[PDB]
């Protein structure tokens, strides 16, 4: 009984693996970057990264390792999810189609088995002879890897050595050897077998365990001619190869331990290391030793590179670029330069890829326009801090606003040859034409003598041989720059009417009645040079030059009104280079053609609201390329203006939109418009590179923000921010944030580096009295106040000494008119465990300056706060404490309400309160206004780990719990027994994923009544630890059974990558148990609906029974479904 | 504050027998499953799994019955009395049989046994047989085990830091309190990704409330290290559990919870926030000291002992106790500390009988020094 | 002497019974 509807807002950002090979050509280069969910082919260029291919699979991608076995010309992928689902799959293209094989799969996992506290390793043979695995404590599960091994048949062999740190297989070894370091009470040691696959069992290594350093973490494999394994510890590094063993013990590496590694030569001379704090290291090791041609290692130094992000996995790509990938920074593309050493430092960025996680805390906040909201989350953490603003669409910023009454054209003027500017703009309404005048930011009306000042003006610019055009509804009558006189006039040789109007650079065709005349833009005259009659009426004309040339269109694509048809036909001719009949009833609106980054196309845009996008072929006919999209739901007319170095198209409608290509396809974005009816690029000297936008009660004049569907600023803090809240009066933020001090030997701390917190414009310190060895850090907790407008730190407030700051809220309390900064924060030591006492302090940021209103003592740790209806909610320890700001500016505790549980979520629907703790125990709370004390209705306690809460309705909430899962329980009231009332039902499961941290309520997409309304009702945002934002709605019973079905019929029809079965992911999993997903809608598979083709949509549909508009319409055709699924997309 | 006493004695029900019937446990239900497990009735005691209790069999019908478990799977179901009386009851204990000899003696019927839980059960019904032992419904409730709090946000990367080296001796300052930060600050390190601080996800680790209550523990009384106190959390719940001197109340809510790290929480704010005990019918008593509760046994400073006609009480140890009267003379007989004489001790104001006196028997011990009281009137305020 | 009294419930010892009866009727109720 939940209904509740799923999608992704924004994919995965962080990244937790990356690897390179020759996976889609023998020849070409690629990076493998999986995300979390999605996996990412690049090919590395000169310049670059060039994508490829983007898919996303049915897990976790816990293992990805590029091989290539003997006899195959490129290397394949091995790709294990979180659930075990192994996977081998090969890059298969022919021509233009790109498609992932599964060359094999199947599920590795164990019946019964404790997961190894270190996690899932997996490795490959260097001669590829099999696939090593280590899921469970005690057991290594190995794969062998033959051809006629398609469903991925394991073996396990027994590990006597319970607690493995680190695995690997050795090179240049003629039968299998693993080389692992692992854990006993008497301290690390290393060891080596020799996996046989014949006995099924290991046997004796090739050299004997060696006692290494208490605190070695990770074996690296060194290949040939030198072999063996180097082994990095916490302190030194050591090779160990039998015979041969060295070590050093540098003192560059104490600081932090070496995390990641990666080789970048192919015999093993040099190597890659990282660290947590995020320096680059290079570990050289030195092969001058060569006694009879044998070549062994004799040195290993070790130097330092630079300062990068801080990188969970790096990539060595090709001319010394190297991939420093990061999962809680941005990603980097670093430069190993050898000769420029600015200061010290080896690396230059190149590039620089965006990453949002991990989210924190986030706030959806309407900063630019009214009814529109956007998130600003608190990504990043420790140098890699900041501040993240999203929002949808390309955003139209206005610079004047003039009031026109329904202006039914508008079009560009140039009154200045030898200028490069335009003057005026040519409004046209229904009967006549107003020449607006604007030299700088007047609103001037200064008629041109050209141009006929009564006449409906279809088209009025700057033609060839400085003449103006102004083919009016009249005549066709020429004009010219200097003299400004006609200097041709093209009358109706039948004194009839022009309908369509289309004239180009050098030429001009119009349309009267059913029959079209192309007339020449003769050097001052106007010559005709052809004359063509259509069968039907002329419902638009399109007559656009291509690349190349621009003084002669090949092609005039032309509507019929009667028909509804696109028929494109040579300019100087008449005959039809290709038909089309798209669509149908609905009359043609506009026709355009256009170049998007050398790739032509011709776009047909109807009258109900739908734009048939078609690629067209400039030497001869066109391409069909049958799609259309519903861009709104009024008739569309398209403008281009480029306005980027790039074409672009925009649609004006009820909804606009601008038509750009990401890489090499359309991509359709959103302006944050109400309704644009014309558009009009105006490069004018007081408005350069504007874009007047005539809507239909006003004109108006602005810029557009960029070209990209969503848009991410960042606003680095170099410091980790922790909760973020909005102050609309004030119009600030306040971020809570924590800086590393270190502990030097002078009794006082010293900051690491520069810091959001150490820079503010002002800057105060907490002075209140209401209560260690050298080299230690401590964490400096402070209030920052960050401006709405510039994000620029205003103010820094720093806390007490040894106190952490937990809980930040915005609002204003009682009858004071005053908004207040509240911050809950708890006295931390670390002789005791758990705190005994805590402050309540009240700011206030009035005329630039943050004081201090009040503060309050309490005994615990405030874990979270909240409003309560002008009370404050605060949560003190294991108690629900209700606060009453009073006159005097001060708190007293109305309400108690002493839990058997630690009160860390708190969430508030009108009188309701929803009370849980990492334990997964939900406990819900309702406040007696009449009695004043809170009451209990219902509870729910289940032992699991669980991450956030959030109240979807009076009567459903919403949570995130252990293995990435999502839940929603839900009460009854209206049973009759006690005994059930006080039970919180549980209706709905899913496997997100991801690890939810925060739970917003609000939505990206502007909110209107709509009179219809949507058939989604709430929206409430989240945003997970990979940096990935999510979307829930409620549905209807009915509308819910019917994309369930949907969904059903899909998992038959698609075919995923690894052959994962959609049910099995999705399926609610924990360590102890696992059920199917129930309640929630995966709303990226029915978003995916979309993208299949004609057939495949068409075997969908059967007996869908999608007539639930009281009947059936059992055949439930195959556009019925494209407006259901298209309102699903709208809402995000 | 220490005298040379074993603390194995009390713990091995030696005032029973000697040549005890010793039976190995091979025993376990399936788990999550519908059960049928006779009753013994006149049995008013909260068994925690883990805790040995000692019991007397006195009428015919009642050791036929045993006689019968005896010849069969040797697990009956102690039930857990909650404030009604009448067998108004919800939760028990499966207690297994290990030990059983006659001792006739005057020669009736009388049997000595002694069983330990095993496992928890919801009972759903409450069938009485006319025999006059009841067999009642049992549903198996399974303990609940977590994972790390760590491992779901966990980043793969830093996963080799995860494996600490061994704890460095034992219980030794600024030895404990910088392994411990070392502990927490490399356990936890990704508690950066979550929007809690690390000390919050220490609150709810197994082994650093383990340490606690180990602290705690020693704290008490001096305690030898890993003085049997078992690794497993579960174990070491259960044994705390057992060994908390709390009310019926208390015990079963204990009973309830379901889970190692939620049962390790309430023991700790139990014994963090409850000192003071009360006299039932009196006001308080001095008995409010729980600073000065010693344990001399094994099992800890609560044991359950059974006197010489059926009753059952579970005693519990302290250093001093007034309020107290003493009536009779230091009997021998019968004292559950083999080195030790009992005397009756008796309340000076409710006179309600609580607590038994001990006298000096031998040399390296502590003279007139001793107290053991019992659940009779104690509650804990 | 022998005294047989001796109470049940807690397992006092008496030489007596009015003792006796005195602390049965201080375990009634
Ligand atoms: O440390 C302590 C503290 C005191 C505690 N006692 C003394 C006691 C008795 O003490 C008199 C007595 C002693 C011995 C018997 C012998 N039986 C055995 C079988 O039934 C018939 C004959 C009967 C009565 C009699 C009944 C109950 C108790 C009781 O709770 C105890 O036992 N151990
Ligand atoms: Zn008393
Ligand atoms: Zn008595």
């Known amino acids: 009984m939940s209904y509740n509807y799923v999608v992704t807002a924004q994919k995965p950002t962080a990244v937790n693996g990356c690897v390179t090979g020759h996976f889609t050509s023998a020849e070409d280069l690629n990076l493998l970057i999986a995300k979390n969910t999605r996996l990412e082919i690049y090919v590395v260029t000169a310049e670059g990264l060039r994508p490829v291919k983007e898919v996303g699979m049915y897990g976790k991608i816990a293992v990805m390792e590029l091989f290539r076995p003997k006899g195959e010309s490129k290397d394949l992928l091995f790709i294990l999810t979180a659930k075990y689902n192994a996977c081998i799959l090969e890059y298969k293209q022919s021509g233009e189609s790109i498609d992932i094989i599964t060359r094999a799969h199947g599920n590795v996992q164990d019946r019964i088995g404790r997961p190894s506290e270190t996690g899932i390793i997996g490795i490959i043979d260097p001669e590829c002879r099999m696939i090593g695995l280590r899921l469970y404590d005690g057991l290594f599960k190995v794969i062998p890897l033959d051809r006629d091994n398609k469903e991925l048949k394991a073996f396990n062999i027994r590990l006597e050595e319970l607690h493995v740190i680190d695995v690997k297989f050795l090179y240049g070894c003629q039968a299998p050897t693993i080389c692992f370091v692992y854990q006993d009470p008497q301290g690390r040691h290393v060891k080596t077998y020799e996996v046989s696959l014949r006995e099924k069992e290991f046997n004796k290594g090739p050299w004997k365990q060696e006692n290494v350093e208490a605190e070695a973490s990770m074996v690296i494999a060194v290949p040939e001619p030198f072999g063996g394994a180097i082994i990095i510890g916490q302190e030194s590094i050591t090779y160990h190869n039998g015979d041969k063993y060295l070590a050093i013990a540098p003192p560059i590496i104490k600081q932090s331990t070496i995390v990641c590694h990666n080789r970048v030569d192919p015999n093993g001379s040099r190597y890659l290391l990282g660290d947590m704090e995020g320096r680059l290291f290079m570990l050289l090791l030195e092969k001058e030793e060569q006694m009879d041609g044998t070549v062994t290692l004799k040195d290993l130094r070790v130097e330092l590179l630079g300062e990068t992000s801080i990188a969970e996995c790096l990539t060595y790509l090709d001319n010394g670029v190297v991939f420093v990938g990061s999962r809680l920074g941005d990603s980097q593309l670093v430069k190993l330069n050898v000769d420029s050493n600015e200061q010290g430092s080896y690396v230059v960025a190149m590039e620089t890829f965006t990453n949002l996680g991990p989210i924190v805390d986030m706030c959806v906040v309407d900063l630019e326009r009214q009814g529109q909201g956007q998130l600003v989350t608190c990504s990043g953490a420790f140098k890699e801090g900041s501040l993240r603003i999203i929002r949808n669409g390309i955003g139209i910023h206005e610079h004047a606003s003039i009031d026109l009454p329904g202006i039914k054209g508008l079009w560009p003027l140039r009154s200045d040859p030898n200028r490069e500017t335009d003057d005026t703009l040519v409004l046209s309404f229904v009967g006549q034409t107003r020449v607006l005048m604007l030299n700088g930011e007047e609103v001037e009306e200064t008629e041109l003598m050209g141009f006929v000042d009564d006449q409906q003006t279809f088209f009025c610019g700057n033609v060839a041989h400085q003449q103006l055009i102004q083919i009016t509804s009249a005549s066709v009558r020429l004009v010219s720059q200097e003299p400004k006189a006609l200097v041709s006039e093209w009358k109706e040789p039948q004194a009839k009417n022009i309908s369509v109007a289309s004239c180009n650079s050098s030429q001009v065709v119009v349309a009267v009645g059913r029959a079209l005349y192309y007339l020449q833009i003769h050097p001052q005259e106007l010559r005709q040079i052809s004359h063509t009659e259509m069968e039907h009426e002329v419902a638009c004309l399109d007559i656009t030059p291509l690349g190349d040339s621009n003084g002669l269109s090949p092609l005039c694509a032309i509507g019929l009104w009667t028909d509804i048809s696109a028929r494109i036909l040579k300019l100087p001719s008449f005959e039809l280079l290709h038909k089309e009949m798209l669509g149908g009833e609905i009359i043609p609106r506009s026709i355009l053609m256009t170049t998007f980054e050398s790739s032509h196309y011709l776009l047909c845009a109807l009258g109900d609201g739908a734009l048939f996008y078609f690629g067209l072929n400039i030497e001869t006919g066109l391409l069909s390329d049958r799609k259309k999209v519903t861009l709104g739901t009024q008739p569309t007319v398209l403008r281009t203006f480029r306005s980027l170095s790039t074409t672009n198209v925009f649609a004006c409608s009820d909804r606009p939109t601008v038509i750009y290509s990401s890489n090499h396809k359309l991509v359709f974005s959103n302006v944050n418009l109400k309704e644009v009816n014309y558009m009009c690029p105006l490069n004018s000297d007081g408005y350069p590179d504007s874009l007047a936008l005539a809507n239909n009660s006003t004109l108006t004049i602005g810029t557009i923000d960029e070209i990209q569907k969503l848009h991410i600023r960042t606003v680095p803090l170099y410091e980790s921010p922790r909760k973020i809240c909005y102050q609309e009066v004030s119009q600030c933020f306040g971020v809570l944030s924590s800086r590393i001090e270190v502990q030097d030997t002078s009794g006082g701390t010293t900051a690491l580096r520069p810091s959001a917190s150490t820079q503010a414009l002002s800057s105060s310190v907490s002075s209140s009295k209401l209560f260690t060895s050298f080299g230690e850090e401590v964490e400096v907790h402070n209030l920052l106040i960050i401006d709405q407008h510039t994000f620029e730190v205003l103010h820094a407030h720093q806390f007490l000494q040894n106190e952490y700051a937990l809980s930040l809220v915005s609002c204003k309390l009682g009858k004071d008119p005053n908004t207040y900064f509240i911050v809950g924060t708890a006295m931390v030591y670390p002789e005791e465990a758990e705190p005994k006492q805590g402050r309540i302090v009240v700011f206030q940021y009035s005329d630039g300056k943050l004081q201090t209103v009040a503060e309050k003592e309490v005994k615990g740790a405030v874990y979270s706060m909240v409003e309560f209806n002008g009370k404050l909610l605060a949560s003190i320890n294991s108690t629900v404490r209700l606060y009453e700001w009073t006159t005097e500016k001060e708190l007293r505790t109305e309400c108690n309400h002493y839990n058997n549980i630690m009160a860390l979520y708190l969430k508030t629907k009108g009188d309701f309160i929803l009370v849980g703790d990492l334990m997964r125990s939900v406990l819900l709370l309702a406040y007696k206004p009449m009695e004043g004390n809170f009451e209990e209705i219902a509870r729910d306690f289940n032992p699991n780990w669980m991450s956030a809460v959030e109240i979807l309705d009076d009567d459903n909430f919403l949570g995130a719990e252990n293995a990435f899962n999502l839940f929603v329980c839900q009460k009854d009231s209206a049973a009759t027994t006690d005994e059930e009332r006080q039970h919180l039902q549980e209706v709905g499961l899913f496997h997100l994923g991801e690890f939810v941290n925060v739970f917003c309520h609000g939505s990206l997409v502007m909110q209107n009544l709509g009179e219809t309304s949507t058939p989604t009702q709430g929206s409430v945002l989240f945003g997970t630890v990979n940096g990935m934002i999510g979307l829930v709605t409620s549905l209807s019973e009915s509308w819910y059974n019917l994309l369930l079905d949907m969904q059903n019929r899909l998992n038959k029809v698609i075919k995923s990558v690894g052959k994962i079965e959609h049910s099995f992911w999705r399926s609610f999993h924990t360590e102890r148990k696992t059920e199917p997903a129930t309640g929630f809608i995966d709303g990226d598979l029915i978003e995916s609906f979309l993208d299949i083709s004609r057939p495949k949509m068409q075997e969908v549909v059967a007996n869908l029974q999608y007539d639930d508009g009281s009947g059936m319409k059992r055949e439930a055709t195959a556009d019925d479904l494209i407006k259901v699924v298209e309102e699903l997309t709208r809402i995000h | ?381 | ?29």
């Open chain 2, 1 to 381: 504050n220490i005298i040379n006493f074993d603390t194995s004695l009390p713990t091995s029900h030696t005032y029973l027998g000697a040549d005890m019937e010793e039976f190995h446990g091979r025993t376990l239900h399936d788990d999550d499953s519908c059960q049928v497990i006779p009753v013994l009735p006149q049995v008013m005691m909260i068994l925690i799994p883990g805790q040995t209790l000692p019991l007397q069999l006195f009428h015919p019908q009642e050791v036929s019955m045993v006689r019968n478990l005896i010849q069969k799977d040797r697990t009956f179901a102690v039930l857990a009395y909650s404030n009604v009386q009448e067998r108004e009851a919800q939760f028990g204990t499966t207690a297994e049989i290990y030990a059983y000899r006659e001792e006739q003696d005057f020669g009736i019927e009388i049997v000595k046994v002694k069983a330990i839980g095993r496992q928890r059960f919801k009972v759903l019904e409450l069938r009485t047989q006319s025999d006059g032992i009841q067999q009642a419904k049992v549903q198996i409730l399974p303990e609940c085990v977590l994972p790390s709090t760590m491992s779901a946000v966990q980043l793969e990367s830093l996963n080799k830091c995860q494996i600490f080296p061994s704890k460095p001796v034992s219980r030794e300052d600024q030895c404990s309190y910088k392994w411990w930060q070392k502990y927490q600050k490399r356990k936890f390190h990704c508690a950066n990704l979550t929007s809690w601080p690390r000390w919050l996800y220490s609150l709810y680790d197994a082994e650093t409330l383990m340490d606690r209550i180990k602290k705690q523990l020693r704290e008490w009384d001096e305690n030898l290290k890993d003085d049997s106190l078992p690794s497993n959390p579960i174990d070491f719940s259960y044994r705390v559990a057992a060994c908390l001197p709390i009310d019926d109340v208390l015990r079963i809510q204990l009973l309830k919870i379901g889970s190692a790290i939620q049962r390790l929480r309430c023991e700790l704010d139990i014994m963090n926030k409850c000192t003071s005990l009360c006299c039932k019918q009196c006001q308080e008593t001095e008995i409010t000291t729980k600073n000065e509760i010693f344990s001399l046994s094994l099992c800890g400073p609560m044991a359950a002992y059974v006197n010489p006609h059926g009753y059952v009480h579970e005693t519990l140890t302290v250093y001093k106790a007034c309020n107290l009267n003493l009536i009779g003379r230091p009997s021998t007989e019968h004292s559950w500390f083999p080195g030790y004489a009992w005397t009756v001790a008796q309340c000076k104001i409710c006179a309600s009988h609580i607590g038994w006196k001990f006298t000096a028997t031998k040399k390296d011990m502590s003279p007139q020094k001793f107290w053991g009281l019992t659940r009779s009137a104690l509650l804990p305020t």
């Open chain 3, 1 to 29: 002497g022998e005294r047989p009294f001796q109470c049940n419930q807690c397992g006092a010892s008496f030489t007596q019974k009015g003792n006796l009866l005195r602390h049965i009727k201080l375990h009634s109720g």
